[PDB]
């Protein structure tokens, strides 16, 4: 029974590593983007097996094999395991998320919103203490003790009927890039510390992400990636 798609696609795998928020911060802005902006990177990540760049959907995958240069570097990701696993033009399943710290004896919470929405900015001031509004909202916020462990299951949250593995259409009449999907994701995830911005610290914190597919289904078989004869 090992060949069953359900029995195959029911295990956790790492996705990406992200830093820990310490302020409201500005969300990344679409491309092309000019210099001088205050948008910060490496704090927000989108839930999607397909390639992405700088927390946004993408078509071509890249890597920084050349370290030297000038400018701002970017994040990238792609589910090597999922893509190599099998062939399916279409796919749908519930996405399960789990997070574990990568620093000694740390405590924090996590925040999420589904597709179509966007990060909530701005901050309040309580008794001379500034706190971003993202602490409270309509959507779940999770809390864990020191050490840390977070787990829950998100339901399907995209308008499209299924998730296209290799799509070839366009999304809009003008300037739309061919083949770039629209909402093939489960939303965005982010982490933050329940402390006022006034007590920000210089040392950076980093955290990994693991995901798991539940109740997977597929359609319209396809091809598999080529491997060299070198």
């Amino acid at each position: 029974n090992h060949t069953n798609v359900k029995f195959l696609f029911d295990r956790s795998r790492l996705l990406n590593v992200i830093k820990v928020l310490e302020k409201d911060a500005v969300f990344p802005r679409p491309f092309p983007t000019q210099e001088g902006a205050q948008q910060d990177d490496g704090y927000f990540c989108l839930l999607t097996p397909r390639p992405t760049v700088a927390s946004r959907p993408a078509t071509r995958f890249g890597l920084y094999a050349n370290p030297s240069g000038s400018g701002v570097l970017a994040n990238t990701s792609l589910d090597f395991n999922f893509y190599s696993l099998a062939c399916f033009t279409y796919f749908r399943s519930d996405l399960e998320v789990t997070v574990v710290s990568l620093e000694p004896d740390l405590e924090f919470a996590v925040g999420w919103f589904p597709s179509g929405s966007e990060y909530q900015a701005s901050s309040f001031v309580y008794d001379q203490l500034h706190v971003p509004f993202h602490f409270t909202g309509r959507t779940p916020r999770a809390f864990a003790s020191k050490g840390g462990k977070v787990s829950f299951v998100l339901p399907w949250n995209s308008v499209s009927s299924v998730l296209p593995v290799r799509w070839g259409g366009a999304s809009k009449l003008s300037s739309a890039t061919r083949g770039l999907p629209a909402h093939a994701d489960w939303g965005t995830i982010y982490a933050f510390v329940p402390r006022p911005n006034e007590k920000k610290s210089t040392a950076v914190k980093h955290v990994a992400v693991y995901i798991r597919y539940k109740n997977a289904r597929a359609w319209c078989p396809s091809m598999l990636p080529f491997r060299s004869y070198k």
Partner: protein, 232 residues
């Protein structure tokens, strides 16, 4: 037997939307019955159904919930707008406000119009809807190809209009971060069909009003947290 302790994977956590209850604190309480209050509410659809009045910025900071039919004539429509809840025109309607607190919607949109003018004046009007295309239609000729209806001035005073629900999905984006097929759904426009009649000694510049309401199949989904900007 002893506690067969099976440790849980991720206990000792706090979750915002945990459905289960918690421990009671001060139980054994009694309350005053409230059956005497009428006008109970069940779902927001009750308020969403009741119509309200839209508005538009004054033609060259005072928005106006009415439009007056001009004496001049042109082939372009007198008033038109895209059907997109993020537009300012809906930015104060009950339907728009409620929709602003959800990820997506589903169903038809209902529009109503009213006339306010003289006694012995008559005329004709044409209502039309145009799905999205390269650009908004301009000429009544081009509009006529699209779906349209005839509203006579004198037959009735409110020729109700409903935009059919058309989209290549099951829902649509309540807000449009970037223009997309699932977000915008073209535009709607009104055209003056023929010159109206000006009777003896009656005032001029009649007045017309428009109202919007959610259709019977209107439905929202995926609640979210509000924008607190209105406090400022």
């Amino acid at each position: 037997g002893p506690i067969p302790t099976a440790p849980r994977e991720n206990s000792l956590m706090f979750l915002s939307t945990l459905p289960d209850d918690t421990v009671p604190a001060y139980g054994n309480v009694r309350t005053p019955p409230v059956n005497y209050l009428p006008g109970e509410i069940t779902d927001l659809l009750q308020l969403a159904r009741i119509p309200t009045l839209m508005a538009f910025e004054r033609v060259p900071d005072t928005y106006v919930p009415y439009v007056a039919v001009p004496t001049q004539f042109d082939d372009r429509p007198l008033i038109s707008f895209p059907i997109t809840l993020s537009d300012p025109v809906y930015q104060n309607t009950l339907v728009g406000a409620i929709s602003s607190n959800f990820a997506n919607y589903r169903g038809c949109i209902q529009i109503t119009l009213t006339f306010c003018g003289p006694m012995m004046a008559r005329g004709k009007f044409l209502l039309s809807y145009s799905p999205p295309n390269g650009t908004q239609p301009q000429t009544l000729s081009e509009a006529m190809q699209c779906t349209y209806s005839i509203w006579d001035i004198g037959l009735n005073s409110s020729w109700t209009f409903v935009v059919p629900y058309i989209s290549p999905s099951d829902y649509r984006e309540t807000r449009a971060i970037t223009n997309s097929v699932y977000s915008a759904d073209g535009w709607f426009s009104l055209h003056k069909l023929t010159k109206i009649t000006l009777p003896p000694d009656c005032p001029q510049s009649p007045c017309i009003l428009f109202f919007a309401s959610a259709g019977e199949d209107y439905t929202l989904r995926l609640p979210v947290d509000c924008n607190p900007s209105y406090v400022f």
